[PDB]
Design a protein around this motif. Structure first.
Motif, mmCIF file in Angstrom:
data_model
loop_
_atom_site.group_PDB
_atom_site.id
_atom_site.type_symbol
_atom_site.label_atom_id
_atom_site.label_comp_id
_atom_site.label_asym_id
_atom_site.label_seq_id
_atom_site.Cartn_x
_atom_site.Cartn_y
_atom_site.Cartn_z
ATOM 1 N N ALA A 14 0.826 -1.209 0.000
ATOM 2 C CA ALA A 14 0.000 0.000 0.000
ATOM 3 C C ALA A 14 0.874 1.278 0.000
ATOM 4 C CB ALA A 14 -0.923 -0.012 1.215
ATOM 5 N N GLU A 44 4.268 2.123 2.101
ATOM 6 C CA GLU A 44 4.670 0.779 2.570
ATOM 7 C C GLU A 44 5.566 0.111 1.530
ATOM 8 O OE1 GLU A 44 0.895 -1.574 3.502
ATOM 9 O OE2 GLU A 44 1.906 -1.527 5.454
ATOM 10 N N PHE A 69 7.735 -3.961 0.860
ATOM 11 C CA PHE A 69 8.036 -5.319 1.277
ATOM 12 C C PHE A 69 9.543 -5.460 1.259
ATOM 13 C CE2 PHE A 69 3.601 -6.397 0.393
ATOM 14 C CZ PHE A 69 3.326 -7.225 1.467
ATOM 15 N N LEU A 118 11.642 -2.497 11.435
ATOM 16 C CA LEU A 118 11.868 -3.929 11.359
ATOM 17 C C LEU A 118 12.944 -4.309 12.345
ATOM 18 C CD1 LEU A 118 11.524 -6.707 9.669
ATOM 19 C CD2 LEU A 118 13.478 -6.019 8.402
ATOM 20 N N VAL A 119 12.750 -5.427 13.053
ATOM 21 C CA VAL A 119 13.706 -5.983 14.009
ATOM 22 C C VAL A 119 13.691 -7.460 13.650
ATOM 23 C CG1 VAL A 119 14.351 -6.350 16.441
ATOM 24 C CG2 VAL A 119 13.283 -4.176 15.743
ATOM 25 N N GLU A 120 14.812 -7.968 13.135
ATOM 26 C CA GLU A 120 14.874 -9.329 12.600
ATOM 27 C C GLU A 120 16.213 -10.054 12.880
ATOM 28 O OE1 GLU A 120 12.731 -11.708 11.044
ATOM 29 O OE2 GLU A 120 12.508 -10.634 9.134
ATOM 30 N N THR A 136 12.120 -17.600 1.693
ATOM 31 C CA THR A 136 10.660 -17.397 1.501
ATOM 32 C C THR A 136 9.933 -16.704 2.649
ATOM 33 O OG1 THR A 136 10.274 -19.671 2.202
ATOM 34 C CG2 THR A 136 10.288 -19.294 -0.190
ATOM 35 N N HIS A 137 10.597 -15.764 3.328
ATOM 36 C CA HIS A 137 10.026 -14.992 4.440
ATOM 37 C C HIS A 137 10.219 -13.517 4.103
ATOM 38 C CE1 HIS A 137 10.034 -18.308 7.684
ATOM 39 N NE2 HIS A 137 10.171 -18.894 6.501
ATOM 40 N N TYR A 138 9.177 -12.718 4.335
ATOM 41 C CA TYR A 138 9.103 -11.308 3.961
ATOM 42 C C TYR A 138 8.484 -10.461 5.056
ATOM 43 C CZ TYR A 138 9.101 -14.279 -0.210
ATOM 44 O OH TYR A 138 9.413 -15.255 -1.121
ATOM 45 N N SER A 139 8.849 -9.187 5.083
ATOM 46 C CA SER A 139 8.299 -8.253 6.044
ATOM 47 C C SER A 139 7.754 -7.027 5.349
ATOM 48 C CB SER A 139 9.355 -7.850 7.061
ATOM 49 O OG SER A 139 9.792 -9.020 7.731
ATOM 50 N N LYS A 140 6.752 -6.414 5.987
ATOM 51 C CA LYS A 140 6.167 -5.177 5.516
ATOM 52 C C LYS A 140 6.721 -4.058 6.399
ATOM 53 C CE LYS A 140 1.604 -5.785 4.441
ATOM 54 N NZ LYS A 140 0.174 -5.377 4.363
ATOM 55 N N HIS A 150 6.680 0.222 7.156
ATOM 56 C CA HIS A 150 5.946 1.478 6.991
ATOM 57 C C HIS A 150 6.918 2.633 6.781
ATOM 58 C CE1 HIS A 150 2.527 -0.409 9.467
ATOM 59 N NE2 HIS A 150 2.411 -0.729 8.180
#
Ligand SMILES: [Cs+]
Ligand SMILES: [Cs+]
Ligand SMILES: [Cs+]
Ligand SMILES: [Cs+]
Lengths: 189, 189
Positions: free
Chosen positions: A3, A6, A8, A32-34, A43-47, A49
Motif C-alpha cells: 500500500a 509501505e 516489502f 523492522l527488528v529481525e 521465503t520470508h518477507y516483512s512489511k 511502513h
C-alpha cells in the motif's frame, strides 16, 4: 502488492553466521527488528511502513562483534531484497528492487547476482545473452520455462562453467546468488 | 498474491512465551520452520509450497514442554493467518483465510477475532452491526475511513465497552484480536 507509504522487504544473509537486523526511519524508530540465519530467508518477507513516498532507510546489522550502519533509499509500493554479505573483515549490504511482472502460465522468471571477481554470461539462450557483472553485479530478469535446469551453460569470457538451478515452479520468480558454478536460490515475494 | 500450489502464511502468537513452529506436508517435509515471539508477527509473512491445489497442512507447535499437532486445510493462491493461543494448560491454533479486496483510496479494512467468553457487537455504524462471536469467533471484514479510532463502541448484549484501535493507514487491512476492551493489532499481507 504494498500500500501507499509501505514496502516489502526480504532479507538474504550470505554471511557465515547469524546476522541481527534493524531498519530505522528518520527518528530512531524501528520499522523492522529481525534475526536472520546464514543462507536465509528464501521465503520470508516483512512489511515496512515509510514516513513518505520515498525515504532513505537506516540498516543496522550485527555480525559477531561488528555493528554496521548501511543506508539504502526506497520508494513506496515496491518490494526489495537486502543482500548481506561478508566484505573483507566486515559485512556490507546491497538493496535490490524486485519486478512486479507475473510470469505467463508454464513459465518462471529468474535473475542473477554475481559475487565472483569475474563477469559472467548465463547462456540459457545463445541468441539472447544474460550478463551478470562481477563484484555483486545484478543481471536483467529472464522468463524461462518451468522445469529442472541441472547444467546451465555459464561463460567467463574464454572459460566454460556449469551451473545447477534445481526445480523452477510455475509462476514463481527466483533470485540466484552465484557464490563459488555454485548458486544460492531465493524466491521473490 | 501467491502463485499456483503456493500460499502466504502469517503466524500470530497470542501465547505468553515464544512458540516454535513447523508446518509439514504429506511426507515429513517442512514447508516452514519458524520461531515466533509473544504478540508477534504483526508484519512478517512466509510463502509455503503445496503439493496440490488443496492440502491439509500439519502444524506442529512447541510451547514450553508441549509439542502440539494441529491440522488445517488450505487452498492455493490464498493468504492465511495462524492464530496460536493458550487453550487451558495447552495451546491450540486456528487458521483464518484473508480477503483479496484492496480498500478504496482514503479507506482501510478491519476484521475482529473475539477471544472472550461473550458475543460482541462492534458498533462502528449503528445501521450496520458488526458481530464477533464468542470463543474465537471471526467477524466479517468492514471498510472504514483511514484515521484514529481511540474509543469504538462495543456491546455485550445489555453492557457497553470502549475499544481503542489506534491509527489505521490508507489502503491497509487489519486484524484485531480482542483479548481482555483490549485488542492486539496485526496487518494482513
Ligand atoms: Cs520468518
Ligand atoms: Cs544512516
Ligand atoms: Cs520475520
Ligand atoms: Cs497431522
Amino acid at each position: 502488492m504494498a500500500a501507499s507509504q509501505e514496502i516489502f522487504l526480504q532479507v538474504l544473509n550470505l554471511a557465515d553466521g547469524d546476522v541481527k537486523v534493524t531498519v530505522l526511519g528518520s527518528r530512531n524508530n524501528s520499522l523492522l527488528v529481525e534475526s536472520v540465519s546464514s543462507f536465509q530467508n528464501t521465503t520470508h518477507y516483512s512489511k515496512l511502513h515509510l514516513e513518505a513516498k520515498s525515504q532513505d532507510l537506516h540498516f543496522h546489522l550485527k555480525y559477531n562483534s561488528l555493528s554496521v550502519h548501511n543506508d539504502h533509499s526506497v520508494e513506496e509500493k515496491n518490494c526489495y531484497q537486502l543482500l548481506i554479505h561478508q566484505d573483507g573483515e566486515s559485512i556490507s549490504s546491497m538493496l535490490v528492487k524486485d519486478t512486479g511482472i507475473k510470469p505467463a502460465n508454464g513459465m518462471a522468471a529468474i535473475r542473477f547476482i554475481n559475487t565472483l571477481h569475474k563477469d559472467l554470461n548465463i547462456s540459457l539462450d545463445t541468441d539472447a545473452p544474460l550478463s551478470v557483472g562481477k563484484d555483486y553485479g545484478v543481471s536483467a530478469y529472464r522468463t524461462v520455462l518451468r522445469g529442472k535446469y541441472p547444467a546451465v551453460h555459464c561463460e567467463t569470457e574464454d572459460k566454460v562453467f556449469s551451473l545447477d538451478l534445481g526445480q523452477l515452479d510455475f509462476g514463481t520468480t527466483y533470485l540466484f546468488v552465484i557464490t563459488n558454478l555454485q548458486a544460492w536460490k531465493a524466491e521473490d515475494i
